[PDB]
Structures are given as C-alpha cells and as structure tokens.
Amino acid sequence: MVKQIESKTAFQEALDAAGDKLVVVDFSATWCGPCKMIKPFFHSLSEKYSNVIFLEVDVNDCQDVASECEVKCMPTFQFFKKGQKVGEFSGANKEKLEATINELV
Amino acid sequence: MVKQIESKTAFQEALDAAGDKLVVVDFSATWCGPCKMIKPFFHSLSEKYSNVIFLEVDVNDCQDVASECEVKCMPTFQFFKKGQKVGEFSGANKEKLEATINELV
C-alpha cells in the first residue's frame, strides 16, 4: 500500500528505512486532473510490487519538500535507491511509470 | 501594473473588460523556485507594455480556475484575445515570454 508523507522528517526517515529497496514518490496536487486520473493505478502498483516502496506527497501540504526536490509539474514521479535520485519524469503516463520501475528495481 | 485575481467571477470579468487587448495570465505557486525567479520580470513587462493586460493567479487560491484552464506546470503563461486562448507555454523563459507578446499583440 501507499505511504502518505506529511513532513520533511517523515520523508527522510522513509528514505532511510527503505534500505536497498527502490522508492517511488508521487508528487501531486488535489486540484490537478491527471493526478486524480492516475491515483488508482499508482495504488494498484503498490499491491503488485511488494518489493518496492510507494510514497505520496501533496505539494501543498509539504511545500518545503516540494521546493527542495525541485518539483515543477504535476504529477512528478521521482525514483530513489539508497538515498539517491536515480530517475525522474512528469505526466500521467501509465506504461512509462511501470516500465521505469522494471528498469530500476 | 499586474492585477491579482482571487475568484472565478473576477477572472471572467477581467477577460470581459479587456475588450480588444491581449491578456497575459501567469499561473503560479508560492513554493515554486522559477515562479519566484520570474516575478520581477513579469511586473516590468506590465510597465513597459501599457496596451496589454497582465493578470496573476495563484493556483492554490483559485483551484477552480487552475483546474478549468487545465494547468499542470508552474509557471504557465496563457494568452487570450477576445475571450479566446490564442497561446500557451510553461517554464520561466524570459525571452520567449516577451517574444510571444510581440507576436500576439
């Protein structure tokens, strides 16, 4: 299932506890049409791939995290392995999302 | 100078009162780095071109306007003439912003 992040402390701790697993973060906004469109698919991925950690961050709720990760489009998916960003793209493209996960896992 | 929009009613009325003038709308978010970076230049344009109307809309303040204009990146500049959208692009590119205004005015 998807973990809801509500502070910078929580964001950093999740990246830590992740260990060697791939982490996928969905940066979204409640008023953005695509974001709402791709939400159910994002949750399905977390049930299919149990060896990957899925996190959700509302940019309005955590303005400090959004600003530091340099987010500028919604939704933006950022990929991390061992505390480091190893991938990134924006837009609600289902095929590309899953294809990227298979490349980095 | 730049007009701050704080409701959908105000947005529609400005587009109306505009008459035959070109309208440039800056869709932004307070936490987005580029947005803050290009703000002073956007205001300078409103003092240079007095025959063009410049409007600013915070996407968090007017979620209904952002959603209907289908905004997905920040900042997004949308151009309107006689109630119709005649141009659009996103990103803080100063040259492109001014060059577009000279093409549509």
Residue positions of B annotated with a catalytic role: 32, 35
Sheet holding B84-90, edge to edge: B3-4, B52-58, B22-28, B76-81, B84-90
Query: What are the C-alpha distances in Å from A61 to residues A39, A40, A103, B24, B95?
Result: 17, 20, 30, 29, 33
CB A29 within 8 A of CB B74: no
A60 has a chain B CB within 8 A of its CB = yes
- What is the signed CA dihedral for B4, B31, B36, B66, rounded to 10 degrees? -40
According to DSSP, the residues that pair with B55 across neighbouring strands are B3, B25
What does chain A look like in DSSP terms, one character per residue? -PEEP-SHHHHHHHHHHTTTSEEEEEEE-TT-HHHHHHHHHHHHHHHH-TTEEEEEEETTTTHHHHHHTT--BSSEEEEEETTEEEEEEES--HHHHHHHHHHH-
CB < 8 Å to B70, chain A:
33
A84: Cβ contacts below 8 Å, ≥ 6 apart: none
- How do A52-58 and A76-81 pair as beta strands? unpaired
Provide the token pair at A11: 């964001």
Element (H, E) at B67: helix B63-68
B29 has a chain A CB within 8 A of its CB = yes
Homologous superfamily assigned to B1-105: Glutaredoxin (3.40.30.10)
**Helix orientation angle between A33-48 and A94-104, rounded to the nearest 10 degrees:** 40
Flag if A60 and B60 touch (Cβ within 8 Å): yes
Q: How many angstroms away from the CA of A93 is the closest CA of chain B?
A: 14
B67 has a chain A CB within 8 A of its CB = yes
Q: How many angstroms away from the CA of B81 is the closest CA of chain A?
A: 25
A59 has a chain B CB within 8 A of its CB = yes
> Measured between CB atoms, which of B31, B63, B71 is closest to A63?
B31
Task: Round to whole Å and give the CA distance between A98 and A90.
Answer: 13
Query: What are the C-alpha distances in Å from B46 to residues A55, B3, B30, B62?
Result: 41, 10, 20, 22
Provide the token pair at A60: 């309005």
Angle in degrees, CA B62, B105, B16, rounded to 5: 45
